[PDB]
């Protein structure tokens, strides 16, 4: 079901989320949470969503694009669940991008993150992964994994001069 | 009359405003602009307003409190016009405060500025001043004079962790 997304200024968004246990991924609740998250992410036309954005300090991330309106250009991102992620940059090369966040409504900010990272996670069935991601996917996983450590993209603005409300950015 | 206040993201808010000439302060227009500004500032329940906030790169600032709702606590600030201001800090002592801006709707950010400055300006009649201001007044004049150099308070956030939407800050 759709859930209330917390906005910037709420102290939760700044706390550290803790790991999900192997047991936990069987609980009826869990499966229902992942459900709500996806329902929520979709209703918001969002590209990804982290558990703490809805008030749950659990290392649970969900992504999924498909013709996303909010970030029109961006290539499609296949629905997937990311649990207990751990990212590591593999380069200093950085791709720029006007990031946005559902917890930071109606605004965009240019942010440069490394364009090639090594992420390690676990999924709903409990499978371990350790791949090297790059491109938009990398950009998305990083933005979303940051939430898990209490970090919002406004913390990484390249410059505060390149930050503002959507409406005016172009108009 | 009330005028449209530009929001953050509009390039004007980042440009430098130029000095007002002694002649200029007689023009019918000028007097009408100061009029609009005051009308605008009041309608917005704002404490101060800089010309560029309404799209005029002229060094014109206007302030005026009296039981302001937006920043409830704040002491009263007598209506006054500040032209071609030039501020200089007189101390490193800084008073903290959760600043807000009409060009940055519905948000607050903790900002520490020097609590005792020396400001020099000219008024509508063309009189030169050179006083030492302190307290809330100092805080207000600095915030507003910054606009004259293309600077918004989000550029001076003490920490991005202490920045967010009003609604949530307390709720
Ligand atoms: Zn976000
Ligand atoms: Zn302002």
UniProtKB/Swiss-Prot annotation, chains A, B:
Transmembrane segments: none annotated. Binds 1 Fe(2+) ion. Keywords: Hydrolase, Iron, Metal-binding, Protein biosynthesis. It is an enzyme of class 3 (hydrolase). Its cofactor is Fe(2+). The keyword Protein biosynthesis applies. It comes from the Bacteria. One of its GO terms (biological process) is translation. The keyword Metal-binding applies. It catalyses: N-terminal N-formyl-L-methionyl-[peptide] + H2O = N-terminal L-methionyl-[peptide] + formate. The active site is at residue 144. InterPro entries: Peptide_deformylase, Peptide_deformylase_sf. SUPFAM superfamilies: Peptide deformylase. Fe cation binds at residues 101, 143, 147. GO terms for molecular function: metal ion binding; peptide deformylase activity. Its EC number is 3.5.1.88. Pfam families: Pep_deformylase (PF01327). NCBIfam families: pept_deformyl (TIGR00079), PRK00150.1-3 (NF001159). Homodimer. Removes the formyl group from the N-terminal Met of newly synthesized proteins. Requires at least a dipeptide for an efficient rate of reaction. N-terminal L-methionine is a prerequisite for activity but the enzyme has broad specificity at other positions. HAMAP family: Pep_deformylase. PANTHER family: PEPTIDE DEFORMYLASE, PEPTIDE DEFORMYLASE 1. Belongs to the polypeptide deformylase family. This is Peptide deformylase. It comes from Leptospira interrogans serogroup Icterohaemorrhagiae serovar Lai (strain 56601).
């Amino acid at each position: 079901s759709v859930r209330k997304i917390l906005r910037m200024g709420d102290p939760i968004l700044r706390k550290i989320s803790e790991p999900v246990t192997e047991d936990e991924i069987q609980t009826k609740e869990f499966k229902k949470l992942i459900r709500d998250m996806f329902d929520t992410m979709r209703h918001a036309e969002g590209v990804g969503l982290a558990a703490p954005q809805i008030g749950i300090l659990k290392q649970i991330v969900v992504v999924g694009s498909e013709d996303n309106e909010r970030y029109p250009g961006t290539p499609d991102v296949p629905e997937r669940i990311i649990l207990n992620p751990v990212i590591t940059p593999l380069t200093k090369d950085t791709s720029g991008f006007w990031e946005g966040c559902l917890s930071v409504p109606g605004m965009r900010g240019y942010v440069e993150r490394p364009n090639q990272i090594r992420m390690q996670w676990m999924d709903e069935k409990g499978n371990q992964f350790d791949e090297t991601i790059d491109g938009y996917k990398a950009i998305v996983y990083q933005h979303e994994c940051d939430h898990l450590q209490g970090i919002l993209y406004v913390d990484r603005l390249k410059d505060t001069k390149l930050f503002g409300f959507n409406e005016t950015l172009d108009s």
